[PDB]
Amino acid sequence: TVKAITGRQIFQPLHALRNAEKVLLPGYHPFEWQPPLKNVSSRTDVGIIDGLSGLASSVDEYPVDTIAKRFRYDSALVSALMDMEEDILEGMRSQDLDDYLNGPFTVVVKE
DNA sequence: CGGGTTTTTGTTAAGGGCTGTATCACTGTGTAAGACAGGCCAGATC
DNA sequence: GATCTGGCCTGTCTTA
DNA sequence: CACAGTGATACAGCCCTTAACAAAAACCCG
What we know:
part of a larger assembly, 1 chains, mainly alpha, two-stranded antiparallel sheet, DNA-binding, recombination/dna
């Protein structure tokens, strides 16, 4: 309606937003653990995956009737850290530190 | 009223990229009480 | 003193 | 034959390029 009345593209179409979404969602930024994760793959492009984690759905074994969707924890934390980079940099600048510091950060979480 | 001359307007083919629209399988709003027929015990009775 | 009547109940159906 | 949504996918539609030609709308002159 805005583009039809005004005649100027103040907002972009839906596909532009759909394309821009791929920057904030997890499984987009590269990373690497010091000591390789145990029993965990190294794919850094793992988005939304099935929550059943490959659970068998055959009629023979234990009947399962639940669906699930979830991210991968490590990619989730990577996306979370990418989301709040500006706040971390501002906190470093406020406490009279250097922006080029790379000391071991400590991040506590609440499940 | 035409040639000579000039400035606009398409026209083909193939490929790229942005925009708009149809298509898929579905939902949430239609949600408490009353009329009535049948069975059954307590009791007045002739 | 069994014998129906009356009312009490009670499950079912009809709209929501 | 209730009907307005609801997010992702595919495809039509509508812009873009080069390349010579080819037609259309006007003014000097005859």
